[PDB]
Amino acid sequence: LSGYGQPIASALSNITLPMQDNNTDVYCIRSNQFSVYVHSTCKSSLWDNVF
Amino acid sequence: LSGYGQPIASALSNITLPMQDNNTDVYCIRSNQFSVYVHSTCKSSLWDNVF
Numbered sequence: 001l002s003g004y005g006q007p008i009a010s011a012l013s014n015i016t017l018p019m020q021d022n023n024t025d026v027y028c029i030r031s032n033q034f035s036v037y038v039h040s041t042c043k044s045s046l047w048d049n050v051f
Numbered sequence: 052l053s054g055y056g057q058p059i060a061s062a063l064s065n066i067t068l069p070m071q072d073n074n075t076d077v078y079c080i081r082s083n084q085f086s087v088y089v090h091s092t093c094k095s096s097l098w099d100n101v102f
């Protein structure tokens with residue numbers, strides 16, 4: 001929450017790709033067909049970046 | 052001063068914005084009118100990156 005009183009989204013938000021070759025930062029499609037989905041979670045802090 | 056004798060500007064130059072919400076990296080406007088000013092300073096080094 002900003003000082004003005006409005007929500008501010010942190011730049012410390014994280015993105016988690018599916019596991020592939022012992023990593024979660026690159027994902028390459030290796031099948032014939034695929035679908036994509038987004039699952040989101042939310043957490044709050046108090047200016048100390050401890051969610 | 053470079054080895055050729057010419058002035059070189061360091062990438063370790065710093066920019067400081069006004070303080071807002073316990074930070075000086077993001078400053079935004081929360082009033083009806085604003086003005087902007089730039090205040091500059093210069094320091095010298097000797098290839099040791101110590102000014």
Ligand SMILES: *[C@@H]1O[C@H](CO)[C@@H](O)[C@H](O)[C@H]1NC(C)=O
Nearest residue numbers: 018019020021022023024025
């Ligand atoms: C990938 O991770 C597994 C599980 O931790 C590990 O046992 C394995 O050695 C890793 N594979 C390779 C080829 O390094």
Ligand SMILES: *[C@@H]1O[C@H](CO)[C@@H](O)[C@H](O)[C@H]1NC(C)=O
Nearest residue numbers: 002003046047048072073074
């Ligand atoms: C901002 O930082 C000060 C210390 O300079 C601290 O006392 C204060 O609680 C912080 N503000 C908030 C809203 O947590």
